[PDB]
Design an enzyme around this catalytic site. Structure first.
Site, PDB file in Angstrom:
ATOM      1  N   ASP B 198       0.812  -1.201   0.000  1.00  0.00           N
ATOM      2  CA  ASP B 198       0.000   0.000   0.000  1.00  0.00           C
ATOM      3  C   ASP B 198       0.856   1.265   0.000  1.00  0.00           C
ATOM      4  O   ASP B 198       1.845   1.354   0.730  1.00  0.00           O
ATOM      5  CB  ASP B 198      -0.877  -0.037   1.247  1.00  0.00           C
ATOM      6  CG  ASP B 198      -1.889   1.058   1.280  1.00  0.00           C
ATOM      7  OD1 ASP B 198      -2.867   0.959   0.517  1.00  0.00           O
ATOM      8  OD2 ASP B 198      -1.714   1.993   2.092  1.00  0.00           O
ATOM      9  N   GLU B 264       1.224  -0.650  -4.882  1.00  0.00           N
ATOM     10  CA  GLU B 264       0.231   0.363  -5.203  1.00  0.00           C
ATOM     11  C   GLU B 264       0.917   1.721  -5.203  1.00  0.00           C
ATOM     12  O   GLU B 264       1.272   2.239  -4.143  1.00  0.00           O
ATOM     13  CB  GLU B 264      -0.936   0.354  -4.217  1.00  0.00           C
ATOM     14  CG  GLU B 264      -2.037   1.300  -4.638  1.00  0.00           C
ATOM     15  CD  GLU B 264      -2.579   2.128  -3.493  1.00  0.00           C
ATOM     16  OE1 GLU B 264      -3.652   2.740  -3.672  1.00  0.00           O
ATOM     17  OE2 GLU B 264      -1.942   2.148  -2.422  1.00  0.00           O
TER      18      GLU B 264
END
Ligand SMILES: [Ca+2]
Ligand SMILES: [Ca+2]
Ligand SMILES: [Mg+2]
Ligand SMILES: [Mg+2]
EC number: 3.2.1.20
Lengths: 531, 531
Positions: B198, B264
């Site tokens: 993330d 990401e």
């Protein structure tokens, strides 16, 4: 030969600069005629003949004083006929430049229009001065300044989108269209195989002659300062082209050879593609609208991403089931070797001739001719129109005269047909290897699959069931790399080098391992495999 | 299988919204465990589990207060183990969301760091106020306002690129990197198969903490008003990701299953691609960086040119020999049916599952779930996070409780698994058709050749020597058209309809003539050519 235009190998001849056959320093038609065997020998099967018509030469042939006559120094109509016959003898189609938008101001029609001859008064676009003086509206010439010129005898302005010596013809007058159409069939009747429609999207203008609105940039008086909604891409042009295409197809059926149309328009991509075919696919137009992508985007610091996306910009926007064409130079453009470098003419060729469809070569590209800027006398495009370079003799064999209409490039003794033919590793031989490869059915008719291989390497696969496959690879970087072509799932590990450019890390006839293909600086190769 | 990630069929589970198994209105791990057979039944072989870790829920799992523990309403570590075991029993890989950039401000580490515990003081980024007062520099949070928050107890500001409840971890401190790496192996030892990293490109910041320059766009104080050269894409992150990948590869060898990394990053395309692999190709990183192209560009008024160029933007910029992935929605994005329309969910699926590589499905896409805007209570992303719609019972079968943590979309009795499974013309059946088709070798491993067919039709050929070929065709216009696919040179004139979307002019199992393939509004089909 009905589908000849779908994979033609085109060569643009500039008649003033190809070959002088009578020692006045000016190319001529007999000169071209004597070199049609040369063109066939290097794999050309179609020529684009820049206008040889009678012309005061303010725009060297694109300002025509008689659409039915040959410029006297180039020869006469019998000379033109001998060239058509010698072209066909050598298996070469001849596409003639056709100049619809404008005539010379020395044309008989315009001379008579000026003095209000009723037969020709309305052949051109005449308007009184605006209320309170000045041009009828704010339209600006493609070359800057007003699109209108005053004539004291008429007391009116005439329209010229190009130079004042190029008055626009009035296609709202049906006798204008009828006369230019008749002139088309005149040249067809002499054996011509098609026409390039010059400046085609300048044909019509707003019927109310309204001012164009401001662009939002550029200085007052500059062409780019107006949004050209009343002077370019006026859509009535499309029906004229579609009607001409229908007349060409009918003529083709009656005479037994396929007549083609190409259009030259600098327009939106959408406005360009409407020349192929109407949006509803009910009408056909040009067989091949000119596609300038490779001139724009094959640049000195391009990478494979930008190159691929430039190619896809044409292909993505094309209508289905039509023919792409590809060109890297012309009489209007700086020569490839000057634009991108002598060390890159070879990979431009490799790409040009292996992309699907029709390739167009500008005279002299095959011996890596360069601009001669110091030769400019008349026009900013002079440097890319110097005489063709044939040998190391006086004036590079273009003429027996030492004074040519433009000077020959000073390096001609190294960059000419005779010297390069003797060097198996020259650009000239590379050109011939590629045009010979274009005859393979896979190149003529195969699928294309192109990819990047990292952002610096472009690869183009041509494949046709039952035939060998061919993979073009270009290194867009000026440094060596060794790359893995394995993303082409269906290629074998081992392939044969069908073509390798003069300065290459491969050699024609060797085998390579495409999981570790070494590419030199600006390398290009065409690899072959039996699948 | 060591290359499972190269053609995975991924499904993103949002634990709070998937299945409530105890009637509190909140999804839980036991609920997910009971539906892993459902997932295998619809062709899913890999899941992305949104963070189930202990969290105060200010960013619903992405503000973690204990990276080693499960949020109590979702269950405990033995429930987690049961989910892993049931996942694997159904042949499903489990990829765990990994949250490296920041912890919750309720994490013990930050609590201790506030009071200058020497064990954890340097786990976060603390700086004195600027001279004269105010934050250390001008950095702005992703969510607006200063990236710095004052703490009077310390008399210093701490950094948060996201909310003030998400203090950034200090990766300049090796103990932080060691501890977060230790935690990765903790979850690996419980059987997980990979991690999504993330917000990975927010990891490092300028070591001099210098002010960021203006961008030239936006009002002072807005995130888009600064050029984030000091807070995004600081290149030290790449070495961290490459080192993690090497550690995952070693662990994969010891334990006998292939662990993957996905990253990401909202970044430049160049910054995104460096997560695959270093520029010099010496280092590997993420197996699959997230590719949001289809979210950005499959839009209501897109045509085939824009769609193809969006796909090519990813493929052209990729490094050679790597795996593309495709995703049309997520827990951060408005649902497809609301974004593009209920009449386009099916063609989005058709494209998603036939592009080369790995497809990622957001829970509920398979029953055409829509945003419920009126359910928003906490977060702008609430509308796309409402409970999964299983049947027509209370709360769509997500829960026995009428009071769910977010309200169920009011149309659930028509858009749910149970109703759609009984309707062989439903989006649910269409989904299963495509995921079943994904297991064909040509889809897993074949080449891809894609084209427009006119500007409104997109076509994608998958071909593999020795196998049948599959041709995906999408109509991007809202009107019927009949098109000629003949530009695909190597396809036969007759093809079989393998898949036809629910509202289609084609029917599965019929023969079509691809010279005249009629497509309805927003149609999508997959055609098959036998070998
Ligand atoms: Ca005109
Ligand atoms: Ca950070
Ligand atoms: Mg040909
Ligand atoms: Mg798979």
């Amino acid at each position: 030969s009905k589908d000849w235009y779908q994979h033609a190998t085109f060569y643009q001849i500039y008649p003033r600069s190809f070959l002088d056959s009578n020692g006045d320093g000016i190319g001529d038609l007999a000169g071209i005629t004597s070199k049609m065997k040369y063109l066939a020998d290097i794999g050309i099967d179609a020529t684009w003949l820049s206008p040889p018509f009678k012309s005061p030469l303010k725009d060297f042939g694109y300002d025509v004083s008689d659409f039915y006559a040959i410029q006297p120094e180039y020869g006469n109509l019998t000379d033109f006929d001998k060239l058509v016959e010698e072209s066909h003898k050598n298996g070469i189609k001849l596409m003639l430049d056709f100049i619809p938008n404008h005539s010379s101001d020395q044309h008989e029609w315009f001379v008579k229009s000026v003095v209000r001859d009723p037969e020709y008064s309305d052949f051109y676009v005449w308007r009184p001065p605006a209320t309170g003086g000045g041009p009828p509206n704010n339209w600006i010439s493609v070359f800057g300044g007003s699109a209108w010129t005053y004539n004291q005898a008429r007391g009116e302005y005439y329209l010229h989108q190009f130079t004042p010596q190029q008055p626009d013809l009035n296609y709202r007058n049906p006798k204008v269209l009828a006369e230019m159409t008749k002139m088309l069939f005149f040249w067809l009747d002499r054996g011509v195989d098609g026409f390039r429609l010059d400046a085609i999207n300048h044909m019509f203008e707003d019927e109310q002659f309204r001012d164009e609105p401001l662009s939002g940039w550029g200085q007052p008086g500059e062409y780019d300062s107006l949004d050209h909604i009343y002077t370019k891409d006026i859509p009535d042009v499309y029906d004229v082209v579609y009607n001409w295409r229908d007349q060409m197809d009918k003529y083709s059926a009656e005479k037994g050879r396929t007549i083609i149309l190409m259009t030259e328009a600098y327009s939106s991509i959408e406005g360009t593609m409407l020349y192929y075919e109407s949006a509803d696919r009910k009408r056909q137009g040009a067989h091949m609208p000119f596609n300038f992508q490779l001139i724009y985007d094959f640049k000195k610091e391009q990478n494979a991403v930008g190159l691929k996306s430039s190619i896809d910009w044409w292909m993505n926007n094309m209508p289905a089931r039509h023919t792409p064409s590809w060109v890297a130079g012309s009489h209007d453009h700086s020569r490839v070797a000057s634009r991108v470098g002598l060390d890159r003419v070879d990979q431009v060729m490799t790409l040009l001739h292996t992309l699907p469809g029709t390739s167009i070569t500008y005279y002299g590209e095959e011996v890596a001719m360069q601009d001669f800027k110091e030769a400019q006398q008349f026009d900013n495009r002079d440097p890319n129109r110097t005489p063709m370079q044939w040998d190391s003799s006086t004036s590079a064999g273009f003429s027996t005269n030492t004074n040519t209409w433009l000077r020959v490039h000073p390096d001609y003794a190294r960059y000419n047909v005779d010297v390069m033919q003797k060097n198996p590793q020259s650009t000239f031989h590379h050109f011939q290897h590629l045009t010979k490869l274009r005859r393979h059915r896979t190149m003529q008719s195969g699928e294309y699959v192109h990819k990047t291989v990292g952002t610096k390497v472009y690869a183009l696969l041509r494949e046709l069931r039952g035939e060998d496959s061919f993979l073009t690879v270009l290194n867009m970087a000026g440094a060596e790399d060794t790359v893995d072509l394995g993303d082409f799932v269906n290629l074998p590990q081992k392939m044969r080098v069908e073509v390798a450019q003069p300065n290459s890390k491969s050699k024609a006839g060797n085998e390579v391992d495409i999981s570790k293909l070494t590419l030199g600086p600006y390398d290009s190769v065409v690899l072959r495999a039996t699948v």
